[PDB]
């Protein structure tokens, strides 16, 4: 489930992510790891809309 | 006073429309920034923003 949460969270799906977040066991670890991945991918300079 | 208020209204309108045009597509919005309207006032969108 954490792998599918990474799948949905990378794609910027933003609403499938919460539905699958509610099913997860390690909830706060999932929220912190997703926050870290997205704060990294917000630094990529091309396609600033996705950023 | 009326012309100052109407100036603020249209500059807000230009900013808000161009951020939509850039958010939906980048390449065509950069096409828009450089065009001269076949002598609107004989100038450019970016040049009128500067002047």
Swiss-Prot record, chain A:
N-glycosylation is not essential for but facilitates cell surface expression, multimerization, association with lipid rafts and ion channel activity. Disruption phenotype: Trpm8-deficient mice have severe behavioral deficits in response to cold stimuli. Expressed in dorsal root and trigeminal ganglia. Specifically expressed in a subset of pain- and temperature-sensing neurons. Not expressed in heavily myelinated neurons. Not expressed in neurons expressing TRPA1 or TRPV1. It is found in: Cell membrane; Membrane raft. Non-selective ion channel permeable to monovalent and divalent cations, including Na(+), K(+), and Ca(2+), with higher permeability for Ca(2+). Activated by multiple factors, such as temperature, voltage, pressure, and changes in osmolality. Activated by cool temperatures (<23-28 degrees Celsius) and by chemical ligands evoking a sensation of coolness, such as menthol and icilin, therefore plays a central role in the detection of environmental cold temperatures. Homotetramer. Interacts (via N-terminus and C-terminus domains) with TCAF1; the interaction stimulates TRPM8 channel activity. Interacts (via N-terminus and C-terminus domains) with TCAF2; the interaction inhibits TRPM8 channel activity. Cooling agents bind within a pocket formed entirely by the S1-S4 helices that opens to the cytoplasm. Belongs to the transient receptor (TC 1.A.4) family. LTrpC subfamily. TRPM8 sub-subfamily. This is Transient receptor potential cation channel subfamily M member 8. It comes from Mus musculus (Mouse). The chain holds residues 561 to 611 of 1104 of the full protein.
